[PDB]
Amino acid sequence: KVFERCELARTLKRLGMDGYRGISLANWMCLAKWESGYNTRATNYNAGDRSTDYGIFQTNSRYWCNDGKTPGAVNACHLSCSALLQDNIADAVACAKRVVRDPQGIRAWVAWRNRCQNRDVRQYVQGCGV
* CATH code, domain with 123: 1.10.530.10
Amino acid in position 125: V
**Count of domains observed in the chain:** 1
Please report, for residues 31, 43, 91, 92, 108, the alpha-carbon distance to residue 39 in angstroms, rounded to integers and kept in the order given.
12, 9, 15, 12, 20
With 0-12 / 13-18 / 19 or more C-beta atoms within 10 angstroms meaning exposed / middle / buried, residue 120 is exposed
Please report, for residues 30, 35, 56, 69, 103, the alpha-carbon distance to residue 38 in angstroms, rounded to integers and kept in the order given.
10, 8, 6, 26, 26
- The three-state secondary structure class of 44 is strand
Nearest 5°: the CA angle 95, 96, 102 is 100
Among this protein's residues, is 7 annotated catalytic? no
Please list, in sequence order, all residues whose beta carbon lies within 8 angstroms of the beta carbon of residue 64, skipping any fewer than 6 positions away: 75, 76, 77, 79, 95, 98, 99
37 within 8 A of 15, measured Cβ to Cβ: no
Q: How many helices (DSSP H) and strands (DSSP E) are in the chain?
A: 4, 3
Among this protein's residues, is 53 annotated catalytic? yes
> Alpha-carbon dihedral of residues 58, 87, 93, 108, nearest 10 degrees?
10
Q: Give the resolution in Å.
A: 1.8
CA distance linking residue 120 with residue 107, whole number of Å = 17
Residue ranges of alpha helices (H) inside 15-102 are: 25-36, 90-99
Marked catalytic residue, from 18, 53, 91, 120: 53
The boundaries of the domain holding residue 12 are 1-130
Pairing label, strands 59-60, 43-46: unpaired
99 within 8 A of 59, measured Cβ to Cβ: yes
Residue ranges of alpha helices (H) inside the chain are: 5-14, 25-36, 90-99, 110-115
Of residues 52, 96, 57, the one with CA closest to residue 104? 96
Marked catalytic residue, from 7, 35, 67, 120: 35
> Alpha-carbon dihedral of residues 128, 21, 45, 49, nearest 10 degrees?
160
